[PDB]
Paper text:
[name] is a prokaryotic ATP-binding cassette (ABC) transporter required for heme assembling in respiratory cytochrome bd oxidase, a promising target for drug discovery. In our structures, [name] and [name] form a heterodimer with each subunit composed of one transmembrane domain (TMD) and one nucleotide-binding domain (NBD). TM4 and TM5 of one subunit associate with TM1-3 and TM6 of another to form a helix bundle in a “domain swapping” manner. The overall fold of [name] belongs to the type IV family of ABC transporters, commonly known as exporters.
The TM1 of MsCydD is short and the Elbow Helix (EH) is missing while the EH of EcCydD is longer than that of [name] and other type IV ABC transporters. Superposition of TMDs in apo MsCydDC shows that the conformation of TM4 is highly bent in [name]. In the apo structure of MsCydDC, there is a “lateral gate” formed between TM4D and TM6D near the cytoplasmic side. The distance between the bending points of the two helices is 17.3 Å. Thus, it is wide enough to let heme pass through. However, MsCydD lacks the whole EH and the gate is largely open in the apo structure. In the heme-loading structure, the two axial His residues are 4.8 Å away from each other, which is perfect to clamp the iron ion. However, in the apo state structure, the corresponding His residues are 6.8 Å apart and they can no longer coordinate to the iron center. (ii) It enters the inward-open apo state of [name] through the wide-open lateral gate between TM4D and TM6D.
Numbering used by the authors:
A (entry chain A): 6 to 317, 327 to 507
B (entry chain B): -5 to 26, 33 to 505
Amino acid sequence: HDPLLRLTLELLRPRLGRFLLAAALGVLSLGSALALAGISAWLITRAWQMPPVLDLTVAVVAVRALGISRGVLGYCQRLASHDSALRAAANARTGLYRKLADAPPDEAMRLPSGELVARLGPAVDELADVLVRALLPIVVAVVLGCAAVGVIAVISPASAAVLAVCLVVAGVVAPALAARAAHASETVAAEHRSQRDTAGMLALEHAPELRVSGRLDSVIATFERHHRAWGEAADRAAAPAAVAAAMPTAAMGVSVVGAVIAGIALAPTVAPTTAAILMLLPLSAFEATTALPDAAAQLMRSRVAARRLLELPDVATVDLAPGDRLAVVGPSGSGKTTMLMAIADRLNGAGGETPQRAAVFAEDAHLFDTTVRDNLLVVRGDATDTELVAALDRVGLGEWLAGLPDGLSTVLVGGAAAVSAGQRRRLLIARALISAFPVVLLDEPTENLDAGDARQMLEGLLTPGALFAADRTVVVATHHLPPGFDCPIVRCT
Amino acid sequence: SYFQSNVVIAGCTIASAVVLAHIVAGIITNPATDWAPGLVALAVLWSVRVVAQWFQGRLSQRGATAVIGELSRQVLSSVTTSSPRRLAADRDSAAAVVTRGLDGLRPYFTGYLPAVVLAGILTPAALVVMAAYDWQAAAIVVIALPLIPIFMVLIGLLTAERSAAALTAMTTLQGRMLDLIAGIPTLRAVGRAGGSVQRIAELSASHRRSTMATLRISFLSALVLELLATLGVALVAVSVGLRLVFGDMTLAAGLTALLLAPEVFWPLRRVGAAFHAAQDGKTAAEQALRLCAEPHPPTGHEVVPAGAPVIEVPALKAVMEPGRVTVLTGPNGVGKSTLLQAILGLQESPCGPILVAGVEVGALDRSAWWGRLAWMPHRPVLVPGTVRENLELLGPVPGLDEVCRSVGFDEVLGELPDGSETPLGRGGVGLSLGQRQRLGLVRALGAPADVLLLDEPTAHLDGALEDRVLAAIVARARAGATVVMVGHRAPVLAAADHVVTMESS
């Protein structure tokens, strides 16, 4: 039981009715094309031995109807298969997001927010792509292979074995070899690829002081040599991809040669029409196979995406009182924020209580690209505009709000990019002020702030009567504590 | 051998179809000779076609790798010129390009270019051969062929109103989803933890129906291509069968036309299938090419006279004479790194013109000018490796011992287990920030240079080391060199004979 299979049933199975609908439409389209080829050969051969024009009427009407049906059914099948795959992906995304809303402290924090997007965006696309390049190619290919082997088998069960062996060889060995070559290419020489992140991340932010000296061209030579080595290694590893590229043509050639050889020794036995059909079908039965040179590649990509999706320190205890001020500081490498969430967890006491007491405010808080009113009512949606304006003025955003064309209704396209970093942290501080949590926990609230303001904001926040008054607890995990100050110190290790 | 290989493939497809049709016609009419020549001809035709396909694959792989390498090298070289004004803005794009961002051009060079070349070669040649064997089927196919562009243009012009609206709704809703999923941890530690689950439901519903509309509009091209490439064969078959029943056309010609219609109509379908997989590579190539042509370095050949020149800034009334210590003070980020990098001549001077030794920097010969100078930047050069090499990238050090003694690098080299041989990581890993700065002074202060520029020389340094480096810099200035810093601290301010107060705006 591989994780891909586990995730397949996990994703709320795609409502198999519309899976089989797409499979049937694809089989109908490709079988219609194959039957058009066969009926075409039969019509030509029958018209050769001069008959009266009575059966040619039904043969001709069948030919024209089959052509038009092939076109329209191909289009409809493409639409239906895409519909099924993308509906499945959407429901899987909704379910996975639902699972990311659980009370216990799951991996929902052990991961950042940007790469959480980098998962939830591409992973659902990959899972959709495993329903377009695994339903269609494999299912339609096996059905059409069976239906085209049987037609030759009933005529003669002697060359049908060769056709089946050849179809299996093409449609299995060729994509398997292509996938293996592609996989082995991108992992081979995974040490000269370090030179990419060495040079391109060396001589792209370090350009001027490299340019003043004559060391630029030395770097150019020293990474070009290793890039060339990587290219040679990748070529050597991906050489067996050309064999897989050329295999289907050799398959078709062997198939048609075998068909002609078999038809030579069976022409006098049967009618001319059957001989022509047996001779001309093999060259037109390989259209389904060519649709899956990437099906194995898509399988590998979806497998790695499924593994990535499946992938989805202790601190001391500190006693707290309702109204104390803490100035927790520590070196880079200490669980200061982890201590913050530990205090929040022990204060909240897990689920079972409605009036949540402690809520951590991380520095990397996302900024919604909505109106400022909506962006600020996330913590509390029952705050009047007067309170928001007063908070913005008291944190240093009255002048920023005054220039806004829509006031509090500014949409702020792009999220955090719509405002400055200091402005964004000011909005975060205002949001923390708005929230009515009995215990408020801050994580570096004085970063990226103004030089003449950050000290004052830190002083006011850690003052028990400047911004948060009396019964409100403020815990700050900062790095710029003033040399002369107060409040207890819980310096970690 | 691209065009040669494609010509070989086209020839061995057309000839294989013709030979097969003739063999079938010959051994249907006479079911009693032709087995030896024709069969061997067909076998060798298929064999050479296979060999040509494999050789084409290898050649395309090699060519794509070479093109990727050359393009990456050219992009990196071009972006690394002077004028860091554009560099600070396009470094993200350049870093994206020389990364797993150009590997998407491999499909463009693998499955699209050979497809379009084969479409351009095989289709007219197969049309010619079919016309030679039978002109009515060729006429039908020809009438069909300029009916793909007409219908495609008609469809894409009649319905070019819903596609744009559907795409706009698609991208807006997708951005809504991406930003909402981006902020889930923020909404986790508040009261509203699961109240947003309902919104994603109909947001997904609307996004998926919008993408349904755009997919329904955008597939019509495939429908048109399939319908025409199939109706062509259907009509060819009907015509050949209906006009062959009156004993007035050889079976071989009919079979040849019937077998050659799919060869005419296939490469266009292959190109259409392979097109959608090459849009990303073309975009990456366009982005890479858009950032190469613009830079064109200028400057003159004037040579500053021997000695330490006089630098003057009329805009800020700052004229700095040789042999003295100068400091710059002001707020953070008011064109001071820009001023320095301008007096290195990399970019234009924001604050008026700058005259070196009486002559403007625009007429300066930068090659010789850069050799008279010790430029210590905020972040020194720290290539992964050892300490010894990192001390030698910025040119050879003629007298590293006394410079290290003056700055105090010996206490750094002394504590290192291997002396100047301890391994050093990327960006300074295994090497302390203030001790990184000390390495910077070691590489900078020790150099033959009559002009000294330093940006905050006392970063991450204690009082004793600050005093030592200030004394060393003062001694270097007394050695007859123009030394200018930008330090904005009391020890730095009270260490230079002149103070410049460059202001904003």
